[PDB]
Design a protein around this ligand. Structure first.
Ligand code: THR
Ligand code: THR
Ligand code: THR
Ligand code: THR
Lengths: 386, 160, 380, 152
C-alpha cells in the first residue's frame, strides 16, 4: 500500500526516539508499503524558535520565518533520514515545497518507485496554514495514499476526556465531520485545517501513538455517506479555556455586527464562537455574545466598552464559563437527542446559560465548576462508555 | 498558524424558525420545550439561546426545523404556554441561512469581521448568528440569499 | 568599501545578543560600506547537532550531515536577517553553496551588494569561507568577532603585564597560533596570507578595534621588525621512539600507524643519528587524549624489532617566543635560553622556525617561563 | 588541512654540539657563543636527553659561509663530547596550515620520500610546516615526490 506518516515533536524528542521511530518506519515498508514520512521539529523546537523570532523581531518577515521554521524541521529530517539509512532503508529528503505545495508530487513518486522512503520537512518557495500536518494530508491526497497517519503521544480519539469521565472509551472510527466538530469545540487533538483537507480530498487519517503498537483511531468517510440507521453519537467535548463577552442592546441594522468584530479583529482578539438571537420587536435591539481565550478577555472588554460610549447599552464579562458539547452524526435525523441532552443536565441540576449547535453538534455554556459533572451526565445519558 | 482554510459558501431555504420568548433561566426549562417537540417527532436542526437578562431572569430560545413542520412546531409550544413558563411563541416561514464553511477561524478573527462587512455592504441584515471554529452561519431573510452569497463569494473569493 | 564580518556562536548566543550584533552590522553599512556577514550556528548548536547525529547513526551519510549542519547555521542566518531588517537594512541570505562555493565564485553576492543589500552567508569552516569570500570579493578587511577582543603579547591571566597588539603580520599570527592557543582557525589565516586579505580579531561586546593581521613580514623593513608575543600550551603529551634505524621508510612506518589510528601529531622532532649504532630518536607531541592510544600502537610495533623503546610524558608544557624581528637579528635565541636559566627552568627539547623558538619544559614551570620571557624582552 | 607549497634550500650548513649536559644554562652557553660572534641563527633542534648518560645534542643551522667558523667557535668552549660540521645539507619543507588534525600529511610526506630513497636526517615540523634536512643532491628528487604526493 501507500502510507503517509507524520511524526510530531513529541515523537522526535531525542536521538533514541528518532532511531525508534526510524525502525517503525522501516517495519512499515517491510510490510509491503511505499512510505512517505513528514517531520515536525524535535520536541518544542518550533515554539522555542517562534519565541526567538519574536524576540529578535516583532512581526518577523515571511521569507526569513520560512527559512527559520524550515531549518528547525530540516534538523529532524536529517536525523530521521540518518536513522532510516542505518537500518537498511534508502532515504530521499524533500522540503514541503520541493514536493508541490500548490498538488504536483512528481518528484516524490519517482523516489517511491525506486524503493526509497521519502521524508518531507519544512517549506521554501511561497507557512500559512497548518505546517507539517497539512503537508502530510496534502501529500496523501496528491499521491493518493491509502492512509495518512499522525503520530504523537496521543494514542487515539476518545468518547470523552478520560481524566474527567472514568468510563470513557477510545473510538475505532468516526467521520471527518464528527472529528471536525469534536475538535472544534473542545478536544484540541489535531490541526483542524489539515482535517478539513482530508475531508475535502477524501484522505483517511489515523491518530495513533509512536510509543505503543495500539492501532489508534481512524478518521474516514463522510457522515453524509453513513446510513441513517447506523449513525451514532460520538463523544463529549469540554473547554474551560474561554471567557464570554456579551454586548447588550445593539440595534438590529446592517453593519452593527461589523462595528463589533472589526474592533476585535484589529485588536487581534481570537473568536471561538459567536451567538446572536432574534431582536425584540419593541425597542428593536438584540444582544451579541462571543467567546474568546481568557487571555484575550480583559482586552476584548476594554475595546467594546470604549465603543459603548453609543452603539450599545452594556458590555458584560465572564471568565468562569465552561463549554460542554455532544457530537454525533446520529443526531442529524433523530428527534429527542436535544431533549435527552437538556434532561441529562437538568437531572444533575446544571443550569444552561447559553446554547449553540450544528447539524451534528449541541453546545451549551455553563459554570466551569459544573463541567465535570455535566460531561459525566451527558456521557452516561447516551451510554457512550463501557 | 494564522491563515484559515475556507472551503465554500452554503445557502439553504428549507426550514422555518420558531422562537420561544421569555423562557425562565433555571434548570429544566429547556427540557420542557425540546421534549415536547421530540414527542411530536419534530426533527429540529440549529438551536440558539443567548444569556438571560438580569432584570427578569428570562431568555429566548430560537430553533429551526423543516419548513413543513414549522407551524406545527410553534403550535405544540403555544398550546403548552398556560403557565408563567413563556410569554409568547413566534413563527417565521420565510427565513434563509447563509454560511461560510472552513477550518481554523478562531485565530483568524478578521474572517468573522469580513463576513459581517460582506453582508453589510450588500445591505443585508444579519438576524441570527451561530458560529464556531469551522463554521459561520447566519439567518437572514430568504430573499437576501442571492445577495448574501455573491457578497461572501466575492469577499473570500470562493468557489469550485 | 567592502567589509566581511564573521560572528561565532558566542556572539549569537541569544536574541538580545543577535539584535546587538545586528545594530553593529547596520552601523557598518551606514558608515559607507558593502557588508557581507557569515554566521555560525547559535551557541553550541553545531556540537549538540554533532552529538545528536552520532547518536542516531555512528557513521552518518555526508548528504544528511550537510543538511543537519546547514539547518543549524540557518537558524542564526534567519534571526540575524530578521534583526537586520527591523533596523532598516534589506537582507539577502545565502547558503554558501549558491553564494560563491567548491572554489569561490561570488557572482550572486556581488550582484546583491550592488543593490545595497546586506548579504548573510550561512553554511554549505565559518571562518575559512568568510576569508574566502573576502578574497573572492576583494574585501578591504575580514573581521572575526567573538568574546576575544584581540591578540595579546601573552596570556593576560598568566602574564599580568600582557598587552593587546595593534598589528602583526600574517605569518607572525600563524606562528603564534601554531604553538599557542587557537584564537583564529589556523587554516583561515593561511588564506588571508595567501590572498592578502587583512583580518581583524575583535570583540562583539565592545567598540574596541582589536588587533589587525595584515601584510607579510617579508615586506616589512628588517630594522623595524619586533618580537610579537609569548605562547603557552599545556595540552600536549610527548612521545619519544628510541632506537630507530636511520634508513629510508622507518619514519614512514611510525607515522603511518599513528595516521591510521587517527593520532593527531604535532611538532614532530628528530635530530642527527649516532655514528656508533647508526640510530636516532624521534619525539613528537600529540593531544593528551591521544597519548595512550598513540602509545599502545608504537609499543606493539616496538616489540617487533622495529625499535628499542617508546617513552611517554603527559606532564610536558610548551612555551614559545614569536616575532619577525628574530629572523635577521642574532642573540635573541641566546636571550631566550638565558631567561629560562635565570628562573631555573630546564630546556628539555628545542624546536624552531625562522621566526619562532619553542621549548618543551615541565608544565609546572610554564607560568614562570612565560613570565620570565615576557619581561626579558620588551613585551609589556 | 591546506597546503600552499613546497620550498627547497641549499644556502645553509648544520652544526651539531654532541654530549651537552641536560642541566639548566648549558644551552645559553652554546648560543651566547654564537650571539657574541654575531652568527645569525636559524634552525635549532634539541631532542630529549639520554637516561643512561644525562646528555643531548644541539643541532643548529646557519648561513653556509658562517658554518666552518661557527663549528670552530664552539670547539674553543670545551665538557662536550664533540662538534660536527656539515655543508652539503639541504632543506625541503611543506608549507601550509592545519596539519595537526590531519596526520596523513606527516605520514605521506615521509612515505613520498622513502619511495625516492632519500636520506631523512633531521625533522622539525609544526602545524604550519613539515621541514626535514636531507642530502643536498636529493633536493630535486625529494621535491618531485612531494609535488606529486600532495599535488602542488
Ligand atoms: C449584527 C446584527 O445585530 C445586525 N443586524 C447586523 O447585521 O449588523
Ligand atoms: C433557559 C434554559 O436553558 C434553562 N437555563 C435550562 O437549564 O433549561
Ligand atoms: C627516520 C628517518 O631518519 C629515516 N631516514 C626515514 O625516513 O625512514
Ligand atoms: C638546553 C638543554 O641542553 C639544557 N637542559 C639547558 O636547559 O640548557
Amino acid at each position: 500500500a501507500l502510507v503517509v506518516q507524520k511524526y510530531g515533536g513529541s515523537s522526535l524528542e531525542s536521538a533514541e526516539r528518532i532511531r525508534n521511530v526510524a525502525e517503525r518506519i522501516v517495519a512499515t515498508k517491510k510490510a509491503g508499503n511505499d512510505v512517505v514520512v513528514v517531520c515536525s521539529a524535535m520536541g518544542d523546537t518550533t515554539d522555542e524558535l517562534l519565541e526567538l523570532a519574536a524576540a529578535v523581531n516583532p512581526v518577523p518577515p515571511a521569507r526569513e520565518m520560512d527559512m527559520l521554521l524550515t531549518a528547525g524541521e530540516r534538523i529532524s529530517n536529517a536525523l530521521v533520514a540518518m536513522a532510516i539509512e542505518s537500518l537498511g532503508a534508502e532515504a530521499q529528503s524533500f522540503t514541503g515545497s520541493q514536493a508541490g505545495v500548490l498538488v504536483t508530487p512528481g518528484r516524490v513518486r519517482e523516489a517511491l518507485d525506486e524503493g526509497k522512503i521519502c521524508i518531507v520537512a519544512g517549506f521554501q518557495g511561497v507557512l500559512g496554514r497548518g505546517g507539517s500536518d497539512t503537508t502530510a494530508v496534502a501529500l496523501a491526497a496528491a499521491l493518493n495514499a491509502d492512509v495518512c497517519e499522525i503520530y504523537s503521544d496521543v494514542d487515539g480519539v476518545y468518547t470523552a476526556d478520560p481524566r474527567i469521565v472514568p468510563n470513557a472509551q477510545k473510538l475505532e472510527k468516526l467521520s471527518f465531520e464528527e472529528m471536525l466538530e469534536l475538535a472544534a469545540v473542545g478536544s484540541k487533538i489535531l490541526v483542524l485545517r489539515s482535517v478539513e483537507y482530508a475531508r475535502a480530498f477524501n484522505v483517511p487519517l489515523r491518530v495513533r501513538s509512536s510509543y505503543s503498537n495500539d492501532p489508534g483511531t481512524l478518521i474516514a468517510g463522510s457522515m453524509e455517506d453513513i446510513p441513517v440507521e447506523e449513525a451514532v453519537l460520538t463523544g463529549v467535548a469540554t473547554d474551560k479555556s474561554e471567557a464570554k463577552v456579551t454586548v447588550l442592546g445593539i440595534s438590529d441594522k446592517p453593519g452593527e455586527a461589523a462595528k463589533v468584530f472589526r474592533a476585535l479583529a484589529d485588536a487581534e482578539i481570537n473568536i471561538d464562537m459567536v451567538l446572536q438571537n432574534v431582536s425584540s420587536v419593541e425597542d428593536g435591539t438584540t444582544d451579541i455574545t462571543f467567546t474568546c481565550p481568557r487571555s484575550d478577555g480583559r482586552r476584548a472588554m476594554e475595546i467594546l466598552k470604549k465603543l459603548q460610549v453609543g452603539n450599545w447599552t452594556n458590555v458584560l464579562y465572564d471568565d468562569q464559563v465552561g463549554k460542554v458539547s455532544l457530537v454525533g452524526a446520529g443526531m442529524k435525523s433523530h428527534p429527542g437527542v436535544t431533549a435527552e441532552f437538556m434532561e441529562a443536565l437538568r437531572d444533575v441540576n446544571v443550569n444552561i446559560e447559553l446554547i449553540s449547535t450544528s447539524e451534528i453538534r449541541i453546545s451549551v455554556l455553563i459554570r466551569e465548576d459544573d463541567l465535570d459533572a455535566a460531561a459525566r451526565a451527558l456521557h452516561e445519558q447516551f451510554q457512550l462508555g463501557g | 498558524m494564522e491563515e484559515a482554510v475556507l472551503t465554500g459558501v452554503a445557502t439553504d431555504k428549507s426550514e422555518a424558525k420558531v422562537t420561544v420568548l421569555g423562557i425562565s433561566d433555571k434548570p429544566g426549562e429547556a427540557a420542557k420545550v425540546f421534549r415536547a417537540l421530540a414527542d411530536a417527532e419534530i426533527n429540529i436542526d440549529m438551536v440558539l439561546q443567548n444569556v438571560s437578562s438580569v432584570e427578569d431572569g428570562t431568555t429566548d430560545i430560537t430553533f429551526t426545523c423543516p419548513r413543513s413542520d414549522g407551524r406545527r412546531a410553534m403550535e405544540i409550544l403555544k398550546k403548552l404556554q398556560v403557565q408563567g413558563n413563556w410569554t409568547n411563541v413566534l413563527y417565521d416561514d420565510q427565513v434563509g441561512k447563509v454560511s461560510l464553511v472552513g477550518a481554523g477561524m478562531k485565530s483568524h478573527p478578521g474572517v468573522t469581521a469580513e463576513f459581517m462587512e460582506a453582508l453589510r455592504d450588500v445591505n443585508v441584515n444579519i438576524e441570527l448568528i451561530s458560529t464556531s471554529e469551522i463554521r459561520i452561519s447566519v439567518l437572514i431573510r430568504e430573499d437576501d440569499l442571492d445577495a448574501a452569497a455573491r457578497a461572501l463569494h466575492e469577499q473570500f473569493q470562493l468557489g469550485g
